[PDB]
């Protein structure tokens, strides 16, 4: 035959590569105003006979998303007020309420005013977690570890979806296969213009909102024999969680300086109650039944899989931390993570503390002061998954214990970008053909 | 689960002789040397890879489930406790004797 080289351009082939994806979405911290207006009709092309070796636990999309979310948070906190004069002695009386314990302190402090040579005298209802003693003298918890800046007032913390679109010459492969664990060859692959609607929801111990699986509860771990690796559970049916702060709060403006305003909890117009989150009892029970079934799939059919509440740590990890309407909740999930499963309209109310001084993305030196939110606040969210850690030293003696997970916040992105891979097209190709010039 | 099985608790070997302590295990296996109540020191990380600063005589090979820990040109200093570890599980180590 004596075939010769023939060059084809536009060949449908690709190789694994890492690139910077750009956001497209249809005020808030995650600036979607400076993002591409997403096209109304997504282009989803089912690639038949293609099997792709996915690995969600080494996805660079997750790292890029985490870096982008942190950078957006810093960018939103930068161009507005910093609360440097607040770190002073706070004479804190107990609140008027006749009694949880001292959860609200009144805290009168001398403060700066517009004229430097003059000092005023204000007060602000702080929380117990935001003040540490130094019998009546207190100080903000962040004083000896971090520089605090005020979370910026008009800016909202409400997540809205953002799509991570790959640039030209790159493609995103979605794994449409159901019952697909994180690693291995996905046989059902599609090419998409951009990802689904991904809401950045910061949370620990419970993945709120987000996607909702397809067929069954999915347990995914980097290695199920490793305790140091967290287990991400994705539900096939959401669990409705109704959260509320019931205190009605009043926001007072204080002038700490020229053009700078500090927002304080001036008063509680109403009755001092404890914030909480309700989870349906029967729904959570059935959900945990599905979870223990899928875990017994991994660990054998004769293990007494029991769940237990989180072991100690920072407050961001021991309790289900999240943000609801601007107020940062930390919910004691000891009622959720209980019970001991064996081989065969009532609600669970979780008492949530609330914090204003926040250290995000596992950092110190950059502390944030969420302003008080006026009025009562209520949220309705979907528990669609869990982060779990398994107690080590089983010694093949069954009775595996699973406690809720930590605040890495890359595991939170891994529950959304598990099915997505980024590839680079290599259109140039050379083949043999009887073609000749 | 993790299953571990090690060689008998005491092997006697002279200077210049080669001894292999086999350890059958499922999972990433690491070899440690513990010297007379002192803290262990990582000889072998993963099945066959050498820690930095460890003597070149130390070596290992993985076939199937068994890891042999081949040591060439045994010396009086190397006589100490040796053990294999996968994750959180540690066997009671053997003890070279001379």
């Amino acid at each position, epitope marked *: 035959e004596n075939l010769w080289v023939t060059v084809y351009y536009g060949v449908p082939v690709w190789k694994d590569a890492e690139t910077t994806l750009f956001c497209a979405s249809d005020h808030n911290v995650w600036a979607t105003h400076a993002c591409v207006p997403t096209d109304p009709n997504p282009q989803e092309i089912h690639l038949e006979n293609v099997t792709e070796e996915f690995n969600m636990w080494k996805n660079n999309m997750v790292e890029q998303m985490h870096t982008d979310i942190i950078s957006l948070w810093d960018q939103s906190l930068k161009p507005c007020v910093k609360l440097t004069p607040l770190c002073v002695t706070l004479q804190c009386t107990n609140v008027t309420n006749n009694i949880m314990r001292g959860e609200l302190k009144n805290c009168s402090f001398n403060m700066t005013t517009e004229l430097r040579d003059k000092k005023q005298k204000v007060y602000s209802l702080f929380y117990r977690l935001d003040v540490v003693q130094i019998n009546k003298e207190y100080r903000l918890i962040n004083c000896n570890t971090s520089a605090i800046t005020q979370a910026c007032p008009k800016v909202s913390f409400e997540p809205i979806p953002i799509h991570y679109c790959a640039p030209a010459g790159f493609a995103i492969l979605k794994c449409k296969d159901k019952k697909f664990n994180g690693t291995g060859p996905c046989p059902s692959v599609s090419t998409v213009q951009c990802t689904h609607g991904i809401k950045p929801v910061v949370s620990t111990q419970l993945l709120l909102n987000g996607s909702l699986a397809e067929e069954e509860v999915m347990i995914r771990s980097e*290695n199920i024999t490793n305790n140091a690796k967290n287990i991400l559970v994705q539900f096939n049916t959401p669990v409705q969680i109704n959260c509320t702060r019931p205190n009605n709060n009043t926001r007072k403006s204080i002038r700490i300086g020229p053009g700078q305003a500090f927002y304080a909890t001036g008063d509680i117009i109403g009755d001092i109650r404890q914030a909480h989150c309700n989870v349906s009892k029967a729904t959570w029970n059935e959900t945990l039944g599905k979870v223990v079934k899928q875990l017994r799939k991994h660990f054998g059919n004769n293990t007494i899989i029991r769940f237990a509440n989180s072991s100690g740590g920072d407050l961001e990890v021991t309790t289900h931390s999240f943000n609801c309407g601007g107020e940062f909740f930390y919910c004691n999930t000891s009622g959720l993570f209980n019970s001991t499963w064996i081989s065969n309209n009532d609600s669970i109310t979780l008492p949530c503390r609330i914090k204003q001084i926040i250290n995000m993305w596992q950092r110190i030196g950059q502390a944030m002061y969420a302003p008080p939110i006026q009025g009562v606040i209520r949220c309705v969210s979907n528990i669609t998954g869990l982060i779990l850690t398994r107690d080590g030293g*089983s010694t093949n003696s069954t009775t595996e214990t699973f406690r809720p997970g930590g605040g890495d916040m890359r595991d939170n992105w891994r529950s959304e970008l598990y099915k997505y891979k980024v590839v680079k097209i290599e259109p140039l190709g050379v083949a043999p053909t009887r073609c000749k010039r | 689960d993790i299953q571990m099985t090690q060689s008998p608790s005491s092997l006697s070997a002279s200077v210049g002789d080669t001894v292999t302590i086999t350890c059958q295990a499922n999972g990433y296996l690491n070899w440690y040397q513990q010297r007379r109540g002192k803290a262990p020191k990582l000889l072998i990380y*993963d099945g066959s890879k050498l820690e930095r600063g460890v003597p070149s005589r130390f070596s290992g090979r993985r076939w199937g489930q068994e890891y042999n820990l081949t040591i060439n040109n045994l010396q009086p200093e190397d006589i100490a406790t040796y053990f294999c570890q996968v994750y959180e599980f540690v066997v*009671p*180590g053997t003890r070279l004797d001379l």
Partner: nanobody
Amino acid sequence: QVQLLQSGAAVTKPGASVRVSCEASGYNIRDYFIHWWRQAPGQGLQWVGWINPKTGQPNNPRQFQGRVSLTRHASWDFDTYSFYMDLKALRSDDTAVYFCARQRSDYWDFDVWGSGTQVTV
């Protein structure tokens, strides 16, 4: 360089509470889990449990659950870390040497260990 300095030997009565300390310095402490091991006299090593230095979350077996407590304190200036292990309900079995080991990688390849705090009830 990388170093994990332990505390001195402790002697406690049965039923008392003992604390062993491990000051870690010389590297990025926040990236590597700090595991605690317990060598009984003449027996093999046992796994007290690991602690994350970023979040403070410990992980201990069923045997040590309810008694052991792994805490971490990051001293200001971010110059050193101090990992503490507290045992609450000591008995005759806790006569042992406690080591603090740095888990470098997913292989659990502990390359740096502490000096070893011997406690005897």
